[PDB]
């Protein structure tokens, strides 16, 4: 799935829209192990 996403960006489909979706203020799926009391933490400023 990650490789297909990069192939999507290689052709330039909505690569700027994907980048905006990876900024820090994003929800994390419950399957991940994260400390309680913080939900919108995953995502990094390195997405730019």
């Amino acid at each position: 799935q990650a490789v297909l996403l990069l192939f999507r960006c290689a052709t330039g489909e909505a690569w700027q829209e994907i980048m905006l979706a990876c900024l820090p203020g994003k929800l994390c799926d419950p399957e991940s192990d994260y400390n309680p009391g913080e939900e919108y933490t995953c995502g990094s400023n390195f997405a730019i």
Binding site: L4, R8, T11, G12, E13
Partner: protein
């Protein structure tokens, strides 16, 4: 045409109604393989015009001609791919 024809025709309406549940509908599974709308008040069956109002589908040679030429210019080709991961599984469409 051979791998798939008329598959993108099952979107999820509301129960006992003819109103599409979501504002930007996407197909369900053809036969229990792709995507199912899990919303409680909705169920999906046949009777949908299509993803782009009927323009984007593979149910005719003229339509198949137009959809493929759209994907060969790399403009809106993931939308056709993503509508297939809903209509059928994730295994077949990505190769095509």
């Amino acid at each position: 045409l051979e791998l798939f024809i008329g598959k993108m025709h099952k979107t999820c309406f509301f129960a006992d109604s003819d109103i599409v549940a979501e504002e930007d509908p996407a197909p369900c599974a053809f036969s229990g393989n792709g995507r199912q709308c899990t919303a409680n008040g909705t169920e999906c069956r046949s009777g949908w015009v299509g993803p782009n109002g009927g323009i984007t589908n593979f149910d005719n040679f003229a339509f198949a001609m137009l959809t493929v030429f759209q994907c060969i210019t790399m403009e809106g080709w993931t939308d056709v791919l993503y509508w297939m991961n809903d209509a059928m599984g994730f295994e077949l469409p990505w190769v095509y």
